[PDB]
Enzyme design. Structure first.
Site, PDB file in Angstrom:
ATOM      1  N   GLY A 168       2.074   6.959   8.718  1.00  0.00           N
ATOM      2  CA  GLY A 168       3.429   7.296   8.422  1.00  0.00           C
ATOM      3  C   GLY A 168       4.433   6.233   8.812  1.00  0.00           C
ATOM      4  O   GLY A 168       5.603   6.333   8.411  1.00  0.00           O
ATOM      5  N   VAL A 194      17.251  16.674   8.755  1.00  0.00           N
ATOM      6  CA  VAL A 194      18.602  17.184   8.965  1.00  0.00           C
ATOM      7  C   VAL A 194      19.623  16.203   8.392  1.00  0.00           C
ATOM      8  O   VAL A 194      19.476  15.002   8.693  1.00  0.00           O
ATOM      9  CB  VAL A 194      18.877  17.435  10.470  1.00  0.00           C
ATOM     10  CG1 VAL A 194      20.286  17.991  10.670  1.00  0.00           C
ATOM     11  CG2 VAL A 194      17.846  18.342  11.115  1.00  0.00           C
ATOM     12  N   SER A 212       3.708   3.074   8.118  1.00  0.00           N
ATOM     13  CA  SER A 212       3.396   1.984   7.204  1.00  0.00           C
ATOM     14  C   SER A 212       4.617   1.598   6.403  1.00  0.00           C
ATOM     15  O   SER A 212       5.407   2.410   5.941  1.00  0.00           O
ATOM     16  CB  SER A 212       2.313   2.315   6.169  1.00  0.00           C
ATOM     17  OG  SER A 212       1.042   2.381   6.794  1.00  0.00           O
ATOM     18  N   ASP A 244       0.995   1.870  19.872  1.00  0.00           N
ATOM     19  CA  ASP A 244       0.643   1.293  18.564  1.00  0.00           C
ATOM     20  C   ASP A 244       1.549   1.916  17.511  1.00  0.00           C
ATOM     21  O   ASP A 244       2.190   2.930  17.825  1.00  0.00           O
ATOM     22  CB  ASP A 244      -0.820   1.561  18.220  1.00  0.00           C
ATOM     23  CG  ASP A 244      -1.471   0.874  17.040  1.00  0.00           C
ATOM     24  OD1 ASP A 244      -0.819  -0.012  16.427  1.00  0.00           O
ATOM     25  OD2 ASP A 244      -2.641   1.225  16.743  1.00  0.00           O
ATOM     26  N   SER A 245       1.584   1.360  16.309  1.00  0.00           N
ATOM     27  CA  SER A 245       2.125   2.105  15.167  1.00  0.00           C
ATOM     28  C   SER A 245       1.029   3.033  14.649  1.00  0.00           C
ATOM     29  O   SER A 245      -0.116   2.984  15.153  1.00  0.00           O
ATOM     30  CB  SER A 245       2.644   1.161  14.096  1.00  0.00           C
ATOM     31  OG  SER A 245       1.745   0.171  13.668  1.00  0.00           O
ATOM     32  N   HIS A 278       0.828  -1.211   0.000  1.00  0.00           N
ATOM     33  CA  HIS A 278       0.000   0.000   0.000  1.00  0.00           C
ATOM     34  C   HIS A 278       0.862   1.261   0.000  1.00  0.00           C
ATOM     35  O   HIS A 278       0.340   2.355  -0.140  1.00  0.00           O
ATOM     36  CB  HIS A 278      -1.020  -0.030   1.117  1.00  0.00           C
ATOM     37  CG  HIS A 278      -0.621   0.469   2.470  1.00  0.00           C
ATOM     38  ND1 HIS A 278      -0.233  -0.388   3.471  1.00  0.00           N
ATOM     39  CD2 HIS A 278      -0.549   1.706   3.002  1.00  0.00           C
ATOM     40  CE1 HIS A 278       0.076   0.306   4.572  1.00  0.00           C
ATOM     41  NE2 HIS A 278      -0.119   1.603   4.296  1.00  0.00           N
ATOM     42  N   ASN A 284      17.261  11.905  12.195  1.00  0.00           N
ATOM     43  CA  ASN A 284      16.426  13.064  11.903  1.00  0.00           C
ATOM     44  C   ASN A 284      16.191  13.140  10.410  1.00  0.00           C
ATOM     45  O   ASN A 284      17.139  13.390   9.667  1.00  0.00           O
ATOM     46  CB  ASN A 284      17.093  14.334  12.464  1.00  0.00           C
ATOM     47  CG  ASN A 284      16.081  15.466  12.456  1.00  0.00           C
ATOM     48  OD1 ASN A 284      15.412  15.657  11.437  1.00  0.00           O
ATOM     49  ND2 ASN A 284      15.900  16.197  13.547  1.00  0.00           N
TER      50      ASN A 284
HETATM   51  N1  TL2 Z   1      -9.073  -6.119   5.802  1.00  0.00           N
HETATM   52  C1  TL2 Z   1      -9.609  -4.985   5.953  1.00  0.00           C
HETATM   53  N2  TL2 Z   1     -10.972  -4.928   6.238  1.00  0.00           N
HETATM   54  C2  TL2 Z   1      -8.862  -3.645   5.818  1.00  0.00           C
HETATM   55  C3  TL2 Z   1      -7.454  -3.630   5.594  1.00  0.00           C
HETATM   56  C4  TL2 Z   1      -6.778  -2.405   5.426  1.00  0.00           C
HETATM   57  C5  TL2 Z   1      -7.490  -1.182   5.458  1.00  0.00           C
HETATM   58  O1  TL2 Z   1      -6.709  -0.008   5.313  1.00  0.00           O
HETATM   59  C6  TL2 Z   1      -7.147   1.203   6.051  1.00  0.00           C
HETATM   60  C7  TL2 Z   1      -7.317   1.030   7.569  1.00  0.00           C
HETATM   61  O2  TL2 Z   1      -5.954   1.135   8.096  1.00  0.00           O
HETATM   62  C8  TL2 Z   1      -5.132   1.806   7.116  1.00  0.00           C
HETATM   63  C9  TL2 Z   1      -6.057   2.252   5.998  1.00  0.00           C
HETATM   64  O3  TL2 Z   1      -6.521   3.585   6.315  1.00  0.00           O
HETATM   65  C10 TL2 Z   1      -5.854   4.073   7.498  1.00  0.00           C
HETATM   66  C11 TL2 Z   1      -4.612   3.164   7.659  1.00  0.00           C
HETATM   67  O4  TL2 Z   1      -4.367   2.988   9.108  1.00  0.00           O
HETATM   68  C12 TL2 Z   1      -3.168   2.478   9.651  1.00  0.00           C
HETATM   69  C13 TL2 Z   1      -1.960   2.309   8.880  1.00  0.00           C
HETATM   70  C14 TL2 Z   1      -0.820   1.783   9.532  1.00  0.00           C
HETATM   71  C15 TL2 Z   1      -0.840   1.440  10.892  1.00  0.00           C
HETATM   72  C16 TL2 Z   1      -2.036   1.613  11.675  1.00  0.00           C
HETATM   73  C17 TL2 Z   1      -2.050   1.213  13.146  1.00  0.00           C
HETATM   74  N3  TL2 Z   1      -2.880   1.890  14.033  1.00  0.00           N
HETATM   75  N4  TL2 Z   1      -1.333   0.268  13.622  1.00  0.00           N
HETATM   76  C18 TL2 Z   1      -3.200   2.205  11.038  1.00  0.00           C
HETATM   77  C19 TL2 Z   1      -8.897  -1.177   5.708  1.00  0.00           C
HETATM   78  C20 TL2 Z   1      -9.583  -2.414   5.831  1.00  0.00           C
HETATM   79 CA    CA Z   2      18.983  12.845   8.254  1.00  0.00          CA
END
Ligand code: TL2
Ligand code: CA
Length: 223
Positions: free
Chosen positions: A175, A57, A177, A171-172, A40, A54
């Protein structure tokens, strides 16, 4: 990374930043010529930035190298993020050193409860927005498949695992990703998706790298 700590410069030497005029995703160096990231995170015109702490920098240990090719997993599904993995070839080999170093691929999958290190330059707030310029780190265990599937009914495939803390706070995030989840010296996960960041009962979801080691090895040997 929400709820983490400042890693310290170059203490995660396999962590890369993907740059297209700006940081947009993490990645992991797996040998001198190849990086593993999330599908993605695909885009054209990627520059891989290695040796970064950084990202705003020039601190003297960076290597900036353009991508010569990108290969998204053949079965990547952009709606579900099933098979959320991609390989990126560097136009020229990185010069490996103690600040720029590869991470090994798994020999087997990691079991639940195994502790891992997750890192990135993503948002550090669970509500609202603040982006660090130095690398952030989080220790988090792999959660059981049952807890994972419960938080996300009908959405988790055998190519996904959850890691983190059900109570929330750590959590992660956006950004981060594409970046690494390392457990016992092996790249076991890739930052993939989740619900918000650091919300209760919504742990991070990670690409299960062990399932892809044969594809990785076959793909890089042929490209
Ligand atoms: N299998 C599903 N139904 C599904 C899979 C991915 C999907 O992508 C969306 C939800 O999460 C992704 C994206 O839109 C937002 C981004 O969020 C993230 C990215 C990376 C990390 C995190 C985290 N909190 N660990 C959250 C939505 C539904
Ligand atoms: Ca640097």
């Amino acid at each position: 990374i929400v709820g983490g700590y400042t890693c310290g410069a170059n203490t995660v030497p396999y962590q890369v930043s993907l740059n297209s005029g700006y940081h947009f995703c993490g990645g992991s160096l797996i040998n001198s010529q190849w990086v593993v990231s999330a599908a993605h995170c695909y885009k054209s015109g990627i520059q891989v930035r290695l040796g970064e702490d950084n990202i705003n920098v020039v601190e003297g240990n960076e290597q900036f190298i353009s991508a010569s090719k990108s290969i998204v997993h053949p079965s990547y599904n952009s709606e579900t993020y099933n098979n959320d993995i991609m390989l990126i070839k560097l136009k020229s080999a990185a010069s490996l050193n103690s600040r720029v170093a590869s991470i090994s691929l798994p020999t087997s999958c990691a079991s639940a409860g195994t502790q891992c290190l997750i890192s990135g330059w993503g948002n550090t707030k669970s509500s609202g927005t603040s982006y660090p310029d130095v690398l952030k780190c989080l220790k988090a265990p792999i959660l059981s498949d049952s807890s994972c599937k419960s938080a996300y009914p009908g959405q988790i495939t055998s190519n996904m695992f959850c890691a983190g803390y059900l109570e929330g706070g750590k959590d992660s995030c956006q950004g981060d990703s594409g970046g690494p989840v390392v457990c016992s010296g092996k790249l076991q996960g890739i930052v993939s998706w989740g619900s918000g960041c650091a919300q209760k009962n919504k742990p991070g979801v990670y690409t299960k790298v062990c399932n892809y080691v044969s594809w990785i090895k076959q793909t890089i040997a042929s490209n």
